[PDB]
Every structure is written in structure tokens, then in C-alpha cells.
Specification:
The PDB classes it as hydrolase/dna. The protein has 294 residues and is an alpha+beta fold. The protein has two domains: 1-141, Homing endonucleases (Endonuclease I-creI); 149-294, no CATH class. 44% of the residues lie in helices and 19% in strands. The chain has helices at residues 6-15, 48-58, 81-90, 97-112, 119-129, 138-143, 160-170, 200-210, 233-246, 252-268, 275-286, and strands at 18-25, 33-44, 62-65, 70-75, 171-178, 186-195, 214-217, 226-230. The protein starts with 5 loop residues before the first helix and ends in an 8-residue tail after the last helix. The chain binds calcium ion (2 copies). Residues 169-170 line the site of one calcium ion. Residues 15-16, 170 line the site of one calcium ion. It binds a DNA duplex (28 and 28 nucleotides) through β1, β2, β4, β5 and β6.
Length: 294
Amino acid sequence: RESINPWILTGFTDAEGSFMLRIRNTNNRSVGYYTSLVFEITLHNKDKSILENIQSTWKVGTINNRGDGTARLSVTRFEDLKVIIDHFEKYPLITQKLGDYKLFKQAFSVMENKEHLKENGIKELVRIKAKMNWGLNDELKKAFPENIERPLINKNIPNLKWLAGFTSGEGTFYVHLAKEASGKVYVRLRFIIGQHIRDKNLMNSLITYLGCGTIQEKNRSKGSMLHFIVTKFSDINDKIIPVFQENTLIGVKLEDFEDWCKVAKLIEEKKHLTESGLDEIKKIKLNMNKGRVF
DNA sequence: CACCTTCCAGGAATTCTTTGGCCTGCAC
DNA sequence: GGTGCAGGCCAAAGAATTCCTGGAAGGT
Ligand SMILES: [Ca+2]
Ligand SMILES: [Ca+2]
């Protein structure tokens, strides 16, 4: 179906997706190496439509339906990769994934000269794979004793469309219920984004760019990880909800968000204290997030 | 028959979600 | 014979995501 806005695309890619450089020796007597370039996303079936719309937008890559209960989009056809690179040069990433993507681009240029089939090709492309992702496997580590640091990237959030894309990937909207013996049962709206410590910068940018929220480190559970949380109702209703209302989310999360706002209006109309409306809230919370059923 | 690329399917590691509960300090 | 609540904190678990790999089907 439909295609996606470019910045929504880049944002969602910062959240999910991987750029990978395969370097595998030849099963043939050829003492050489075959080098593959792959950009692939793997999601729960709920969001398969996204995988389509990405395809529909790039018109490259294949979409495989897995038995894992997930769906995967792969782009490895060499010339098709141009599309990808063309995109992320006109709409760059901002998370640490940018680093990996850049190495991707680098590798592509090395293979574009068709020199990868050359000894020089092998020498350079390994120097690249060592830097991106988990680096070299043990085999390539023994075959190529070499010297390979890595500084953190600190880019600024481009716009709100990027945020709607990214949040559609890694954001969360939670309705917290605490029900003293008063029996009342309190309601609270939380908007959470969980990131690895390496993306601390992004987190910081988040607060300033939204002008609200608070960062909770989470190290007594080793992930590492840390969270960006917004719960103050003034900020949720005056700062968060309008953002994602004018820059719509994508994927099932949108529906979640919508139900979220249902709760938010009820909490604004003060109808959350009456038990009937509180029942309405409970019903919504029960049928969203992990509770929704597709 | 051979190189090489593009694809699928599998899978282990781990990074997200998503989920709660506890605490505190104002207003009143 | 302070207390109710909103705005914060503390975290866990599994599963959705991150990466990688083996094997083989398409083009020359
Ligand atoms: Ca992710
Ligand atoms: Ca997600």
C-alpha cells in the first residue's frame, strides 16, 4: 500500500533496522572472499505493512514471511543499494546507527570499483567490517591481524517527522493504574523511550527538543540502557499529544497512541474519578499494547 | 562447469518494549 | 490527632529486535 514520508522513513530506521557487511570465504578452491552488502529489517507480523510501504517507497528489496512469527525486508542487490544510500544522504540518521551506515557507504564505494574481487579489496573491506556492528568473527580475526577506536556520534534531532518515525519504532505509551485502601485507583500517563547507553546524546537532545521529560538511568539491571520518560500531565497534553497528532505515527503503535489519547481526554475532563469513566479507561488499557490482539 | 551474486531460512545474543510497584513533597 | 495525589522513582521479564551464518538457487 501507501508510501512513507522521507523523514518518517529515516526516523523509523534509526529505531529499527541493521546495515550489515558479510565477508565470507569462498567454498570454492578459489582462495578468495565473497562480500555481500545487506540492509534488513525484521519485525513482528503486526507491522508487516510497514515493510511493504518501505518497499513501496523504495521499490527495491524483497519481503520474506518467516515462521518466526515475523517478517523481513532485505536489500542486497548491489545496484538497488544506491537507492538506500541516496536516501540517507538526503535524509541522514542521527543515532549511533549513523556510524554503521557511514561504514556501509564506505564499503559500497570500495565494491563499486569492482576491486573487492582484488587483494586490495579484501584488505580494505575487512578494515571496514572490523569497525561496524560486532566486528570481525574469529576466522577473519586470525586471517587478518590488523589494528582497529570508535567515538560516539552526537547529531541534533532534525524535525518532528523524524521523531514520529523513530517513536513509531521504539517509543511506548503506557497507562499506569494504581488502585491506599480508599479504593479510588489512580491513573497516570507515561511516554517512554528505551535506548542503549551509547545513544545517551540522543536522549539528552530529546528533553531539550521536547522541552519536558526526565531521564532515568537503568544500571541496576545491566542492559546497559536508560529511559526517557514524560508523565507530567501538563507536558503530555500540551507538548506530547499535539506533536504526535500533527505528525502521525505509523504501524500498530498509532492505534495504541490513539487509545492513549482517549485516556488522556478522560483525564482532562476530570471524568477519571467517576467509576464509570474509570471503567471505560480500564477497558481501553486492557486492549492495547501487549493486550491488543491481531 | 565454473565464478559470483541474490535469496531464503535458521538461530543465538540482547536490546527493547511493556509492565508494574514504591516514594515524596506540595495543596489543602 | 496530616492525607490525598501528581509527579517522580525504583526496577523485571520475555520477546521483539540485532546481528550473523549456512546452504542454494539465478545469471553470466
Ligand atoms: Ca531497535
Ligand atoms: Ca518496535
